[PDB]
């Protein structure tokens, strides 16, 4: 017993000798506000360990919902979050009428193209992560007046194909997710491509996810008066995105062996 026991004895002894007026003394013992404890706080991939914590403070009758009930910004609350998955212009090129069948019109490095310039919605985050796992939704657009005709082959080529491209027989590329799109009939092609690789994750700022290309199925048959400047545009959206490995700002990191 002791030194904890004192509030009671003093409080009691004071109590025992008390008369009509009452006790002439009160004693209370307890633990100090500053006790021997340890506090731990964890934020995204971080852990703060403090062995000398203090009572946390905050304003009067505070509201941490942080949501503007007036919606001075009429946007979905998760706008900023989904922003990087937004549809963007990945490429544009002008098909030249002279081009032969099987000629490559244009191509886009996948998936590093979504971070093609610092003006890409996904460029921001892509910088702070070395690993990526995502799905794509392409929309190759090619517009041509009715008078003209022709056809282009929009096809997705995984790294395997891109690597050994010359070893593959054109005309068989229809085995890959493609869209033989006959001009004067269709002005846009849609391609939904899931994560395809021989590795669970692909290094950010790499072409390992393969690349989307556009070939000349049948050259452009442009009549005399008809226009001769056909542009091919490639748009891309991320069906699903996933940045995992943390890393310094835009520093080449090897996720592979």
């Amino acid at each position: 017993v002791g030194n904890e026991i004192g509030g009671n004895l003093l409080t009691k002894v004071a109590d025992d000798a008390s008369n009509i007026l009452g006790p002439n003394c009160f004693a209370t013992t307890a633990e100090p506000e500053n006790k021997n404890v340890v506090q731990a706080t964890t934020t995204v991939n971080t852990t703060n360990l403090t062995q000398h914590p203090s009572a946390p403070t905050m304003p009067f009758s505070p509201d941490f919902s942080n949501v503007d009930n007036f919606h001075s910004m009429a946007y979905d609350i998760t706008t900023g979050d989904k922003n990087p998955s937004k549809l963007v212009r990945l490429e544009t090129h002008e098909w030249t009428p002279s081009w032969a069948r099987g000629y490559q019109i244009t191509h886009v490095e996948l998936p590093k193209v979504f971070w093609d310039h610092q003006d890409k919605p996904a460029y921001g985050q892509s910088r702070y992560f070395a690993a990526v796992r995502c799905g794509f939704h392409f929309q190759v657009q090619v517009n041509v007046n009715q008078g003209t005709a022709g056809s282009a082959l929009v096809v997705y080529e995984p790294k395997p194909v891109v690597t050994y491209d010359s070893k593959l027989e054109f005309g068989a590329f229809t085995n890959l997710p493609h869209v033989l799109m006959n001009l004067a009939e269709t002005t846009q092609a849609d391609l939904c491509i899931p994560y395809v690789a021989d590795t669970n994750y692909v290094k950010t700022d790499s072409s390992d996810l393969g690349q989307l290309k556009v070939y000349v199925w049948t050259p452009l048959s442009i009549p005399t008066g008809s226009a001769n400047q056909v542009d091919v545009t490639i748009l891309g959206s991320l069906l699903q995105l996933d940045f995992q490995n943390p890393r310094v700002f835009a520093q080449d990191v090897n996720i592979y062996d």
Binding site: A30, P56, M58, P62
Partner: protein
């Protein structure tokens, strides 16, 4: 029973969150609440519900008068300086000291000077010469909250008088507010 914490022994670094109505005692002492009046004079609605002088303007002609309206660092209204943000109805008391005429009065929070050129759209209540009116301007503020300190914390007041002859005079102004919403109290002000 009573803990040593409530007997004076505490730690200043363990006061957060802000606003701890902790009771303090001793053997012969207890918090005793005694009220001398049927109501409180400390409540924001009551205290501020009472006007206080603002400023005066002397007019020798109809030219319009626009003045930024701000919280006082002078009267009992100074108690507002203990806060950072305000929002709510604003009571403006105007006295028209003139022999023969009328006084157009209007209030807007809009900073643009031009919007006040055509005074009628804004309001323009009419106080005949020798009369005083008390108009309650609503919170038509383009900002959800009014920093309480700003030289224009309160919206601008417009006074244009439709005089008739060579008559001239002066317009004294007093301000008060109806039900005030103050937030995030800041540190006490200094003295001049």
């Amino acid at each position: 029973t009573m803990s040593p914490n409530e007997l004076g022994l505490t730690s200043a670094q363990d006061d957060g969150p802000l606003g701890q109505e902790k009771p303090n005692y001793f053997l012969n002492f207890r918090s005793m609440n005694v009220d001398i009046f049927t109501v409180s004079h400390t409540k924001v609605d009551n205290l501020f519900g009472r006007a206080w002088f603002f400023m005066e303007h002397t007019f020798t002609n109809e030219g319009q008068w626009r003045v930024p309206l701000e919280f006082p660092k002078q009267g009992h209204g100074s108690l507002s300086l203990l806060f950072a943000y305000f929002t709510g109805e604003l009571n403006i008391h105007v006295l028209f000291l003139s022999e023969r005429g009328f006084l157009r009065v209007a209030h807007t929070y809009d900073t643009s000077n031009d919007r006040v050129n055509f005074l009628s759209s804004n309001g323009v209540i009419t106080v005949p010469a020798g009369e005083q009116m008390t108009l309650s301007a609503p919170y038509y503020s383009n900002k959800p909250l009014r920093t309480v300190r700003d030289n224009n914390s309160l919206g601008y007041l417009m006074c244009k008088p439709f005089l008739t002859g060579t008559s001239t005079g002066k317009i004294e102004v007093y301000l008060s507010l109806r039900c005030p919403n103050f937030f995030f109290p800041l540190p006490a002000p200094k003295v001049t």
